[PDB]
Design a protein around this nucleic acid. Structure first.
Lengths: 144, 112, 64, 106
RNA sequence: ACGUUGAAGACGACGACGUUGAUAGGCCGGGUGUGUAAGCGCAGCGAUGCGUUGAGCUAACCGGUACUAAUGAACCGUGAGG
RNA sequence: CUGGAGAACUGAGGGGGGCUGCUCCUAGUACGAGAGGACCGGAGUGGACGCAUCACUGGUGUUCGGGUUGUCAUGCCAAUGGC
RNA sequence: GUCAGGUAGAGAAUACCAAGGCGCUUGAGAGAACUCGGGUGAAGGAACUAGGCAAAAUGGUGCCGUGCACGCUGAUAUGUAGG
């Protein structure tokens, strides 16, 4: 996701929680790594959009192979042998609904305040590294 | 960490801005020309609309009656339809004295 | 300053109790004895004890 | 625009209009174990910070012996109502010099 | 590379954008700060205050707009891989 | 199993790390002839060190704005600017 | 050693001007890894040190307190004691 400023939310009881507000477009998978080829399980995902004239076709061909629209940058995360993903699958922010602690890259064990899909938005209690408009990686807290 | 003294810097731009208006073109170092823009166009924008207060404020800057007369009379109407970008910078090699990058800075006019 | 009426008017803090290298309790002074200094984002900008118990956790102080 | 859209619904439009140097009464919720009580605070506004959802104002109260300053968050749920008693006729944005007033009749 | 940017903390090959083009320097609108400007008018024919007017002004920032300028030729790196 | 580029991964090895104290439930429990009264695990509340670090709480901000003393220039008073 | 104007001021200090004398014999852009020197910056104002040293604070006089007055006075008086 992309960091978009910071604000606070007031609760009904009265306390105010300072929240880092992160915008997370739909993340669309581009490549799936497996034991047979890469020796490990991971999925490569992209986000955003890039100008056609500026995206070099070595990546465009790589994107076109998966039917994926050219995004900005590429990231991939290792799997936990408990989930499966297919090339071209679109991943939205609702996956964070069931998890209360998240890791933002690293500042770890941050409470999640609110998640919505209609506006592709995620909320984190605290501060995260980087200025506004920077790229952030949000994953569930490992220290359970 | 950035993410002449103030008085000298302010006076120099005030003088150079007046000379630019008077002559419509001047030869100066490229860094000076770039920084001069942030002082020059704001004067022309104010001159686009004429008022007693604007005339007084325009005088408080450049502290010269000739320039104020030059403004609000033809620089105003000549740039009324233009939304910014009243200045043009042309690089003209380097100064022989100290190899400084020199450039002409001139208002978009003189199309006779 | 002393909020109570124990007689003392001005006191000096000589040690901040509650932890190593530190309404918290403090040690103040020629008589040395403990004392106590008296969420929405608001801020509030502007008592002696017996070294064993409060006896001016602070029910009496709030009541008075 | 993401930030602004997020705070518009959180802000409250029932904010009364007051100016620095005005005598203001503000009601604030209080929690004592399991009860909600309304506490009334009387004072004079000496500073207002306008930032939208983060707008706040400082009120100085001359208590029994010494003054007490209190910074309220205008849009916080803790504050319920704000009422103006006197229209102070001052000509300064921040009245910090009262640490060490006329009436506007307008 | 050159030019418009450099909040990565000056050894700088680094984030993006360089005319199907808003990164920066301007012209507008909104918010904040400053808290009653210049000019005009009534009374006192002075020093203040009120109307004019919660207004005038506001840099590095927010929301828009390319009628200005980053344009069009080189140099470097090759042509089927023991 | 040495052609010329632009990305995403597997991480051996190495470096910075194994905070502290108190209360409550467990429990008028274990040990002991009584009183006094647990330890550990779990949860909660402070302080110190380090990374991130500004929507909200302070300070600072030689450019903009408000107010002003002595003197001077812009042929003048008023209205400004510079020191 | 002498001659050294106007305003402000107790003065021969200091600041601001006229006349006169000058820009001091390398410059144009970019910002600080804090080598040096000032103003300002929360305060339990001594948590530093042999010594609160050097800074800062401070200084005055439309004065009755062992705190008050201070930049301007429609008017008293369109200049009051008086040389």
């Amino acid at each position: 996701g992309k960091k978009v400023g910071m604000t606070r939310i007031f609760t009904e009881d009265g306390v105010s929680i300072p929240v880092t507000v992160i915008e997370v477009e739909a993340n669309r998978v581009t490549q799936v790594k497996d034991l047979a080829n890469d020796g490990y399980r991971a999925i490569q995902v992209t986000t955003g959009a890039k100008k056609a004239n500026r995206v070099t076709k070595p990546e465009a061909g790589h994107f076109a192979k998966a039917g994926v629209e050219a995004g900005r940058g590429l990231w991939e995360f290792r799997l936990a042998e408990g989930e499966e993903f297919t090339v071209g699958q679109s991943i939205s922010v609702e996956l964070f609904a069931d998890v209360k602690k998240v890791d933002v890259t690293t500042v770890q064990s941050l409470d999640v305040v609110r998640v919505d899909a209609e506006r592709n938005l995620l909320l984190v209690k605290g501060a995260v590294p980087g200025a506004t408009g920077s790229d952030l990686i949000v994953k569930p807290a490992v220290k359970a | 960490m950035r993410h002449r003294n103030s008085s000298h810097r302010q006076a120099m731009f005030r003088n150079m801005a007046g000379s630019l208006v008077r002559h419509e073109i001047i030869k100066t170092t490229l860094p000076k020309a770039k920084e001069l823009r942030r002082v020059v166009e704001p004067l022309i924008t104010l001159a686009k609309t004429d008022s007693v207060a604007n005339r007084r404020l325009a005088f408080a800057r450049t502290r010269d009656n000739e320039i104020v007369a030059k403004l609000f009379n033809e620089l105003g109407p000549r740039f009324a339809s233009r939304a910014g970008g009243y200045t043009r910078i042309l690089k003209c090699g380097f100064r022989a004295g100290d190899n400084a990058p020199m450039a002409y800075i001139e208002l978009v006019d003189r199309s006779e | 300053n002393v909020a109570d009426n124990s007689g003392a008017r001005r006191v000096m803090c000589i040690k901040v109790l509650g932890g190593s290298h530190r309404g918290d309790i403090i040690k103040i002074t020629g008589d040395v004895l403990k004392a106590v200094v008296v969420p929405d984002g608001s801020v509030i900008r502007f008592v002696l004890l017996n070294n064993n118990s409060e006896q001016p956790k602070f029910m009496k102080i709030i009541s008075l | 625009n993401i930030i602004k859209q997020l705070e518009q619904e959180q802000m409250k439009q029932d904010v009364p209009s007051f100016r620095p140097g005005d005598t203001v009464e503000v009601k604030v919720w209080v929690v004592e174990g399991s009860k909600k009580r309304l506490q009334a605070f009387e004072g004079v506004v000496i500073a207002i910070r306008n930032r939208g959802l983060h707008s706040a104002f400082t009120v100085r109260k001359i208590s029994n012996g010494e003054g007490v300053e209190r910074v309220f968050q205008t849009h916080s749920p803790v504050v319920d109502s704000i009422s103006v008693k006197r229209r102070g006729a001052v000509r300064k944005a921040k009245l910090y010099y009262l640490r060490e007033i006329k009436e506007r009749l307008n």
